Design a protein around this ligand. Structure first.
Ligand SMILES: [Zn+2]
Ligand SMILES: [Zn+2]
Lengths: 440, 441
């Protein structure tokens, strides 16, 4: 199995990310395209990792052999490849990236012609092909390779034409691009809006992606904002599908907080009948949505579930804690750059600091206790402690909740309780911990 | 073993020329470059085959993985890749081409940093490396890939600076680029000198390279010259390292004939102390060189032997009947474009037509007879008939010669006699055939 959690990603030459697997993957996707009679044309992009190039050309040789043409966008954020894949009539889109992962990793993200990340069924169809034989286009109609000049232009202009009328931001912004795909691309977008910004990590050398910077190292942007006495800090990850921001006091606002702000200005964000979050979304937001009559859905936690739930309910704006924010009014995937622009459009509506747009009042605190077991789990074993979870939640009322999740890969039950009162979160967590030992 | 008679060439997929092999080859050479502490930089080019693109990218992924940068010149003649390899400080040059082979074949030609085709010893190193494991640059220092814009300009300008003043050709030329790597390129070079020409095969579509055209199909240019009433015909093969020309009558002048012309104007060609030919060189040319006191050497049949003999004797101009012509005053390999301009520089010297540059008189004729045997023919087998070969040649004097050859590792002996008199060539070949049948197997 090649996909699974994350989906094709590992250390270079110490994983599945070898030059031979990637060549075979390219060919396999090409064979599926030929089989399905889709356009013999795909789009490729990459982040800043030095291994990206050779892995890309490996993919390309596989594709070309299959008879598929490749248009190279070079170094662009993940959302740009999806964008061009939908805009133009490509059969699929590839991104050579390991996203937020350490610089020694890499992988491939796959998008279908509709611009969406491959689904469970499509991934297994690809894998069946990979384990098949390498196939050469039977009529010798082999594919070409072209590099698109000024590749980011279309995406930039698409975003500008939609938000130029709203954006009027005059504050000082610190931008952390993780030395990743958003390097330079993000600044070119910002210039288009005449934004006063400062870059702190837009100098890729092929080995510094996500190193002590970007969305997964929010400490960097928080210190820079304080240092620079900035009004806002925007931090993106390696492929820029993840965004985290900080306010004027260097206070972090995560994917949950960001989604809450967009929700509050959903008209400017294109409109939405509801908001999709996850099992991890802070209840302070759930309470806020209910108080303002905004439908809220907790998705089955991460990897493509937020998208499937958005489509299921006809909602447009959804996101997760890590910073993956999706707006179906414009994109088909998490987009840090596009979310940044929405935010800047929002911050232009009121003459108040960024911290005043943020959900007011202290967010709920969490207590997590990993209960070590010696035996496996299951669903019927989770139903033995259901009555005790309900008791806790009944007594917590609107001031807290319970989340029980198994590890699946190890005999461990993670018991979490989040509440307004941390003293109380830790109390009820310890209570549940004891009940599971008695019941299991 | 991967280097063969043609040196890494074969049917696409259905051979050793797969995406995986090409990927291991790219890397392999990368490792050798790292091992030898050479510049981590190589030049890449290709012919018009549609299969060249994907094979190239396979190669490149392997090179990059090894830590090697790649400068891609796109579709250009083989000699161009060597020019750029030598001019710039690259460690090697790659050509994705199967040369004159049918459109269904492909392959890779390799040049060292000195711009010469890899020798036997260097080939072995590669083969030993390939059989290694696939090696990733240990410090995560992976290669880049860049496409050079207007890739052929330096080549064209170099040939132009040299010949601009030699060349003043006013005749009508027909060019056959074999729908190959010279398509458009050769026209661009010919434009530099204001040549009056007509193109008949510079419309590549990835499947028509060498199809009923180019150096391996001289009929195309012969017929074109007649209908066009042209003064000259120039035909190149798929990667343009061969050249065959045609005079105003549609009469073919092959590599032997071209080399003889360069010999007569060796000074305008940079100079040369002697000429290197092959075992196939028509003895009429050999008699001609001897008559004009030009040292002549017969090389051991093509396969990089002409260049090895050029270097050894310190000569500059050599070639073979196929049309591979080498001038060490400028290039390091066979180049049909440069040879073309050299000829037009020569044809600018006299107010006579192309047919009058040829060796005047009838060339000798040949009779080839194959003799099937039980085993491949070794030198001990050729010694058994040495006395009969000597007898025939002794009686032929200057009017002919013998050439006996094995068929590589095939169980066949090739008996050839070259003579002024065709009847006699057939007679003597038949005689030797009978001697072989009596003495061998
Ligand atoms: Zn990411
Ligand atoms: Zn050739």
């Amino acid at each position: 199995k090649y996909f699974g959690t994350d989906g094709i990603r590992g250390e270079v030459a110490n994983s599945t990310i070898t030059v031979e697997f990637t060549q075979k993957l390219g060919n396999a996707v090409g064979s599926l395209i030929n089989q399905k009679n889709y356009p013999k044309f795909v789009i490729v992009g990459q982040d800043t990792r030095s291994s990206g190039g050779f892995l890309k050309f490996a993919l390309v040789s596989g594709l070309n052999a299959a008879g598929i043409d490749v248009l190279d966008l070079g170094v662009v954020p993940t959302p740009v490849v999806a964008f061009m894949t939908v805009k133009h009539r490509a059969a699929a889109g590839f991104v050579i990236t390991a996203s937020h992962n350490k610089f020694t990793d890499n992988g491939i993200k796959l998008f279908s012609s509709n611009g969406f990340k491959l689904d469970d069924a499509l991934e297994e169809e690809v894998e069946d092909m990979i384990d098949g034989d390498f196939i050469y286009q039977p009529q010798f109609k082999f594919g070409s390779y072209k590099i698109l000049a000024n590749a980011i232009d279309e995406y930039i202009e698409s975003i500008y034409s939609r938000f130029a009328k709203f954006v009027n931001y005059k504050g000082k912004v610190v931008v952390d691009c993780a030395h990743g795909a958003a390097s330079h691309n993000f600044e070119a977008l910002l210039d288009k809006f005449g934004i006063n910004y400062v870059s702190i990590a837009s100098n890729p050398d092929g080995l510094n992606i996500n190193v002590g910077c970007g969305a997964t190292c929010v400490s960097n942007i928080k210190k820079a904002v304080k240092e620079q006495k900035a009004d806002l800090g925007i931090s993106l990850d390696g492929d820029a599908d993840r965004i985290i921001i900080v306010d004027e006091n260097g206070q972090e606002i995560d994917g949950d907080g960001i989604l809450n702000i967009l929700a509050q200005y959903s008209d400017i964000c294109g409109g939405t009948n509801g908001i999709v979050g996850t099992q991890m979304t802070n209840m302070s937001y759930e309470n806020h949505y209910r108080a303002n009559k905004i439908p809220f859905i907790r998705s089955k936690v991460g990897d493509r579930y937020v998208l499937e739930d958005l489509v299921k309910y006809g909602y447009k704006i959804g996101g997760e804690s890590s910073g993956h924010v999706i707006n179906l009014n414009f994109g088909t995937t998490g987009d840090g750059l596009f979310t940044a622009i929405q935010l800047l459009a929002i911050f232009s509506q009121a003459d108040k600091p960024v911290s005043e747009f943020k959900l007011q009042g202290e967010l709920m605190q969490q207590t997590l206790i990993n209960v070590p077991l010696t035996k496996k789990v299951a669903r019927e074993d989770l139903q033995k402690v259901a009555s005790d979870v309900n008791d806790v939640e009944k007594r917590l009322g609107n001031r807290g909740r319970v989340l029980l999740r198994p590890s699946g890969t190890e005999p461990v039950l993670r018991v979490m309780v989040e509440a307004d009162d941390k003293s109380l979160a830790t109390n009820e967590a310890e209570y549940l911990v004891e009940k599971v030992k008695q019941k299991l």
